[PDB]
Design a protein around this ligand. Structure first.
Ligand SMILES: N[C@H](CCC(=O)N[C@@H](CS)C(=O)NCC(=O)O)C(=O)O
Ligand SMILES: C[As](C)(=O)[O-]
Length: 86
């Protein structure tokens, strides 16, 4: 098992597409839901200064796999083949 963390909000379809991808491939994940604008911007600013992201984030979903920042849904799909090797 690889360790997957996804940061999301409700009413974000790209967050659902990301989760659905993991689910359709039987990959478990831990979801953190941050619905309010205040909580999300604090999370963005925190991550953007944490050293852990590979670009400055300002949307959800944000996906991390084994502690490596992958990105949003576009990035997930771009790496679909490699992630399914893990
Ligand atoms: N240029 C991308 C388009 C992104 C997209 O297709 N939707 C976003 C949801 S706001 C996403 O998570 N897709 C992949 C990504 O942005 O990295 C962006 O910054 O939003
Ligand atoms: C602009 As948003 C909170 O759907 O990533």
């Amino acid at each position: 098992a690889m360790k997957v963390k996804i940061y999301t909000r409700n009413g974000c379809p790209y967050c659902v597409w990301a989760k659905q991808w993991f689910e359709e491939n039987n990959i478990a994940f831990d979801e953190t839901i941050i619905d309010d604008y205040a909580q999300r911007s604090k999370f963005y600013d925190e991550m953007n200064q944490s050293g852990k992201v590979i670009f400055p984030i300002s949307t959800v979903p944000q996906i991390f796999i084994d502690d490596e920042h992958i990105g949003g849904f576009t990035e997930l799909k771009a790496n679909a083949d490699k992630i399914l090797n893990k």
